[PDB]
Amino acid sequence: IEPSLKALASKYNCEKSICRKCYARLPPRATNCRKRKCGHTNQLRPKKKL
Amino acid sequence: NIPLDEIFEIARKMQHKSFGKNLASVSKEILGTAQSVGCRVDGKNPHDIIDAINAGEIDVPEN
Amino acid sequence: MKYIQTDQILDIPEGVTVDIKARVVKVTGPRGELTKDLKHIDVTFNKINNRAIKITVHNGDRKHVAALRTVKSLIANLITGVTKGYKYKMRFVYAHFPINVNIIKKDGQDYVEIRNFLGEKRVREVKIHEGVTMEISSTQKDELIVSGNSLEAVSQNAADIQQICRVRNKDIRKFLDGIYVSERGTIVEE
Amino acid sequence: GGAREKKVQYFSKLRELLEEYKSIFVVGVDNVSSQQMHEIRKALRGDAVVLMGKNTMVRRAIRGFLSELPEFEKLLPFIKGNVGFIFTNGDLKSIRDIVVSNVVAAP
Amino acid sequence: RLNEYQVIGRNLPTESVPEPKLFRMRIFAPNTVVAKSRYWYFLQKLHKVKKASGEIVSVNIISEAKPTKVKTFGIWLRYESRSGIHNMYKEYRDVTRVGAVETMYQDLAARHRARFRSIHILKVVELEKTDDVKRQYVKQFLTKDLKFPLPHRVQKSKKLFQATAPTTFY
RNA sequence: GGCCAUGGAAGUCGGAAUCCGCUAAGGAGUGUGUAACAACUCACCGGCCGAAUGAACUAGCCCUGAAAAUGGAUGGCGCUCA
Ligand SMILES: [Mg+2]
Ligand SMILES: [Mg+2]
Ligand SMILES: [Mg+2]
Ligand SMILES: [Mg+2]
Ligand SMILES: [Mg+2]
Ligand SMILES: [Mg+2]
Ligand SMILES: [Mg+2]
Ligand SMILES: [Mg+2]
Ligand SMILES: [Mg+2]
Ligand SMILES: [Mg+2]
Ligand SMILES: [Zn+2]
Numbered sequence: 001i002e003p004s005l006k007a008l009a010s011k012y013n014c015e016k017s018i019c020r021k022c023y024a025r026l027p028p029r030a031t032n033c034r035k036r037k038c039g040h041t042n043q044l045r046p047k048k049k050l
Numbered sequence: 051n052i053p054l055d056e057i058f059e060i061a062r063k064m065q066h067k068s069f070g071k072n073l074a075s076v077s078k079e080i081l082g083t084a085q086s087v088g089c090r091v092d093g094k095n096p097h098d099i100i101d102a103i104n105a106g107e108i109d110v111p112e113n
Numbered sequence: 114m115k116y117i118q119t120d121q122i123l124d125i126p127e128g129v130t131v132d133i134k135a136r137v138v139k140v141t142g143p144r145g146e147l148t149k150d151l152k153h154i155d156v157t158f159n160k161i162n163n164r165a166i167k168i169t170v171h172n173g174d175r176k177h178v179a180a181l182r183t184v185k186s187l188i189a190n191l192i193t194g195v196t197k198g199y200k201y202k203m204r205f206v207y208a209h210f211p212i213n214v215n216i217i218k219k220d221g222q223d224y225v226e227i228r229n230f231l232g233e234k235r236v237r238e239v240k241i242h243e244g245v246t247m248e249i250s251s252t253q254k255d256e257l258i259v260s261g262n263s264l265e266a267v268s269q270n271a272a273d274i275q276q277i278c279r280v281r282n283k284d285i286r287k288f289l290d291g292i293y294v295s296e297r298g299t300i301v302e303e
Numbered sequence: 304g305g306a307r308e309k310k311v312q313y314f315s316k317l318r319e320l321l322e323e324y325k326s327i328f329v330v331g332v333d334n335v336s337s338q339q340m341h342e343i344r345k346a347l348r349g350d351a352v353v354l355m356g357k358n359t360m361v362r363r364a365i366r367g368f369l370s371e372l373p374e375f376e377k378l379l380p381f382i383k384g385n386v387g388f389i390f391t392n393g394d395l396k397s398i399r400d401i402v403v404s405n406v407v408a409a410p
Numbered sequence: 411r412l413n414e415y416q417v418i419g420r421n422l423p424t425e426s427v428p429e430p431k432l433f434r435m436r437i438f439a440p441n442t443v444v445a446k447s448r449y450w451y452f453l454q455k456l457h458k459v460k461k462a463s464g465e466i467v468s469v470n471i472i473s474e475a476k477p478t479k480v481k482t483f484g485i486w487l488r489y490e491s492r493s494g495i496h497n498m499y500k501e502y503r504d505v506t507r508v509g510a511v512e513t514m515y516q517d518l519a520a521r522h523r524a525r526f527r528s529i530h531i532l533k534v535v536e537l538e539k540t541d542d543v544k545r546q547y548v549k550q551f552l553t554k555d556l557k558f559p560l561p562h563r564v565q566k567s568k569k570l571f572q573a574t575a576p577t578t579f580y
Numbered sequence: 581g582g583c584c585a586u587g588g589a590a591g592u593c594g595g596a597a598u599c600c601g602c603u604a605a606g607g608a609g610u611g612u613g614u615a616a617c618a619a620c621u622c623a624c625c626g627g628c629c630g631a632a633u634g635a636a637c638u639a640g641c642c643c644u645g646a647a648a649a650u651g652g653a654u655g656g657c658g659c660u661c662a
Contacts, residue, residue: 114546114547115547116550117550117551117556117558118558155561157561171558171559171561172558172561
């Protein structure tokens with residue numbers, strides 16, 4: 001993948017934040033989880049990279 | 051120590067660095083990284099020689 | 114807090130004639146007409162002039178107030194859909210297996226046919242929504258142009274194409290293959 | 304306060320030499336690197352001054368200074384948009400000669 | 411349904427002090443039996459006096475000065491919650507000082523589960539200047555030429571059945 | 581291209597350091613990218629719109645926390661400006 005296309009793909013697959021209790025895939029700038037099952041927690045962490 | 055009179059030459063030597071309004075600011079800049087590792091810089095560490103020089107210790111108007 | 118009154122101002126460009134009656138908005142412009150029913154929202158409309166419309170919510174709570182600027186934005190998107198159009202550009206992203214994309218017509222319906230995606234023998238078919246135009250870009254290699262008056266249909270068809278090309282049982286950080294929306298603009302450039 | 308110190312400080316040197324130097328003029332710039340400026344300064348150690356700052360504040364501090372040097376009386380509705388400040392005391396011919404250049408302009 | 415009372419009391423005179431100082435309180439109470447009780451409740455929060463060692467001197471109703479002039483009142487409160495003791499300040503629109511206090515008791519009952527027993531009224535003040543108004547939910551009614559409709563009118567019927575379709579215009 | 585480590589690390593591998601100068605602005609640097617630079621993005625200061633904004637805390641209702649065995653009990657129906 002050319003770097004221009006690899007950044008486009010990374011925008012949807014990699015550039016995310018993850019809820020620490022229910023593993024939801026959240027926007028990188030999210031402050032709370034959107035799922036009700038975890039209580040809209042603020043305990044987030046960035047999605048890990050290769 | 052090693053401030054000597056020959057460090058004021060490194061100023062005119064590297065007189066192509068900090069455009070510091072007055073040439074003494076070259077020394078000031080030169081010294082500014084002299085603490086990078088920290089050595090025998092006037093038998094001490096910079097930020098005490100430099101900072102004080104800006105505060106007004108002796109006087110080196112150097113033309 | 115029950116805000117006493119909240120207002121938003123629609124702006125109608127020169128060639129556009131909005132027409133509202135009983136929360137059914139019909140926006141007419143050079144590019145055509147679009148209509149939308151808002152019977153699920155409690156809003157009222159006042160025609161300020163031929164170029165401006167007041168949109169009002171009376172005595173609305175926090176969530177019911179939240180539903181007001183979204184009405185404004187939807188009608189503005191209608192206006193720019195009938196005066197400028199919408200255009201989404203998609204780039205075909207693959208590491209090894211080229212994606213063979215065709216515009217087919219089966220059963221009298223237009224379909225987007227994805228083949229060889231990640232080497233699969235499966236043939237993916239995405240129905241092309243009404244009012245949505247597909248085109249294979251000639252000026253760009255591996256580019257799809259999704260265009261139309263309605264932003265909702267265009268973006269949702271684009272999303273269908275993107276979602277059908279998801280990677281299963283792999284590390285998607287490494288296996289970045291898929292079809293992704295690369296550019297969101299308008300038919301009329303600005 | 305904190306910033307108001309530096310705020311009134313920017314309003315300190317803002318004048319002082321103001322009366323000392325002569326009537327200045329426009330000083331417009333855009334997309335100018337920091338090195339760019341830095342060098343221009345060297346070309347003006349004593350040739351001129353290279354004052355810079357915000358737009359609205361720069362008015363205010365002096366917009367009311369119509370008591371110490373009223374003179375202006377109207378020499379203010381000219382700081383519009385990106386606007387710096389370059390002092391001087393010489394002649395018009397010896398003005399752009401000691402600036403301009405230092406160009407990185409391009410597409 | 412409340413009234414505002416002026417209650418005046420004093421310590422019982424002694425041969426040492428034959429004219430103790432007279433203290434007045436403004437009490438919002440439903441009747442005069444509770445008005446004199448609340449007085450002793452608050453004096454024993456402040457002064458070395460009791461109902462047994464004291465004497466009620468005067469109880470008078472305080473009527474609104476302009477009961478048909480629309481005002482904005484600020485009320486300062488000190489209430490007890492399930493966890494602690496808190497100070498609060500709130501604002502109300504009404505024509506009588508008593509009617510704003512009735513709304514206050516309903517209001518802290520509804521949003522904080524604060525019972526009548528858990529509330530101390532520190533001060534009720536009529537706000538003279540429009541700049542004196544701090545709260546949004548009453549400041550929005552101080553705008554010039556305020557108009558608003560009342561959509562979705564529900565009509566109460568005396569009969570169970572109506573032969574024509576319902577309407578909510580108004 | 582700061583020092584030292586380092587095959588290379590030049591801000592973005594790792595350690596003493598956290599300074600100076602011009603500045604209104606810039607960290608010996610918050611990231612994506614390189615074998616490494618470069619490159620772009622930030623931190624902060626600018627132009628622009630112009631009236632409000634941010635942070636911490638308290639307690640009400642609601643949600644999560646909240647997993648057991650016949651199908652089933654606010655008494656039942658049902659009830660959402662109740
Ligand atoms: Mg972590
Ligand atoms: Mg898996
Ligand atoms: Mg695996
Ligand atoms: Mg300014
Ligand atoms: Mg209220
Ligand atoms: Mg009928
Ligand atoms: Mg409470
Ligand atoms: Mg349970
Ligand atoms: Mg059972
Ligand atoms: Mg139940
Ligand atoms: Zn979650």
